[PDB]
Amino acid sequence: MMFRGIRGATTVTEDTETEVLNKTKQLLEAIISRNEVDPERVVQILISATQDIHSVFPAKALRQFEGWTYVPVTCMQELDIHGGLKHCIRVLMTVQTDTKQEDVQHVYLEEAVTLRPDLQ
Amino acid sequence: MMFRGIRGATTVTEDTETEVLNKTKQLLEAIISRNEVDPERVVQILISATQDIHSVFPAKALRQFEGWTYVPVTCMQELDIHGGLKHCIRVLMTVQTDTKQEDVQHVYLEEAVTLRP
Amino acid sequence: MMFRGIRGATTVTEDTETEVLNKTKQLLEAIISRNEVDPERVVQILISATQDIHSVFPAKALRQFEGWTYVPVTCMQELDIHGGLKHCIRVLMTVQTDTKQEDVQHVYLEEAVTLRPDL
């Protein structure tokens, strides 16, 4: 019974509640599908946002996910790095999975494609 | 065994070390008691605070729990969300437990009772 | 099999990329060596920095570690505590290890040496 962190990153086009929730939802949906994540196997989720996002906690998006009511989630501010990607939401989901470490599916969407390791 | 995150949240009325530590201690005490948490089964603890809290690291409250000296804890700044609860301290404790996900008892105290689902 | 957080802390003399990366690398190297950490056993890593560090994400230092390219890592902002250490980088590495809680070797370097828990 092993555990793995699963990362995701995305961006919003503006700091509005609809955009923050929709983009966070889309990122979570991709993490969940690609890693076949059962909510009952999720230890916890962390979600960071850059300090230019104030409209809504990205964690509220989890309310839209059937079966995820009891998955603990909390947020944190991301560092403000010169040249860092603006309006960026990052997920670190801790899942009970037996997949080999190198075979975990980390997800980069929207402008956060630019953070994908192979593009560095 | 399985592992589970346990959430808590509380608030203080002012940014003082006494209030931050007292309220953080009371929140941790409730998490620990209601979930029968032994320190050796705690992987780690994260504690966030809103950016109106500068008085003390909430992690210092662990000094009041005998046997918790070596439980790793680190802090982080919570997002500043318009309309979000002010002076708010949030805990995420990761614990070895076979308790079913829906039976883990998360704890919301003080003005953070408004945050409970 | 048990899981344990391993903490570290260090400081930088200036907010410049190569200083931040080298200090973070040195802290990670010490955590890894002293705890004999196999990357494949690491669930995830968090690295925080105080609000006076803007030059680079400390997490970029992990790219310098052969064998660690699949370890997930992300950053966050540390609280700004009056009397807290300035220019401070902190690590929380979550490792699958059966080592007893009191035997884990948490690492405190540079100006952060007095932050160790039992002090």
In three state form, how does the secondary structure of chain A look?
A: CCEEEEEEEEECCCCCHHHHHHHHHHHHHHHHHHCCCCHHHEEEEEEEECCCCCCCCHHHHHHHCCCCCCCCEEEEECCCCCCCCCCEEEEEEEEECCCCHHHCCCEECHHHHHHCHHHC
Sign of the Cα torsion A119, C48, A71, B110 reads: negative
From the annotation, which residues of A make up the binding site for prephenate?
A: 7, 90, 108
To the nearest whole angstrom, how far is the Cα of A34 from the nearest Cα of chain C?
16
Expressed in Å, this structure's resolution amounts to 1.1
Question: Is C90 among the catalytic positions?
Answer: yes
Query: Sheet holding A73-77: strands in order across?
Result: A73-77, A42-49, A88-96, A3-11, A107-108
Active site residue C41: no
Using a 10 angstrom Cβ sphere, with 0-12 exposed, 13-18 middle and 19 or more buried, the burial of residue A107 is buried
The structure tokens listed for C23 are: 């200090």
**What are the CA-CA distances from residue B27 to residues A11, B102, B110, B111 (Å)?**
34, 20, 9, 12
Contacts of B50 in chain C (CB under 8 A): none
Residue A27 one-letter amino acid: L
Which approach determined this entry? X-ray
A54–B5 CB contact, under 8 Å: no
Amino acid at A85: L
Interface test with C, best of A81, A91, A96 (most C CBs within 10 A): A81
Retrieve residue B32's tokens. Answer: 């620990």
Greatest CA separation for chain B: 40
- C62's torsion region: left (phi>0), alpha (psi -120 to 50) or beta? alpha
Q: What tokens appear for C70 in the block? A: 């699949």
Catalytic residue flag (residue B108): yes
- Chains in touch with C (≥3 Cβ pairs < 8 A): A, B
The answer to whether A69 faces chain C, any CB pair under 8 Å, is no
**DSSP conformational letter for C55:** S
B67, closest residue in chain C (CA to CA) = C102
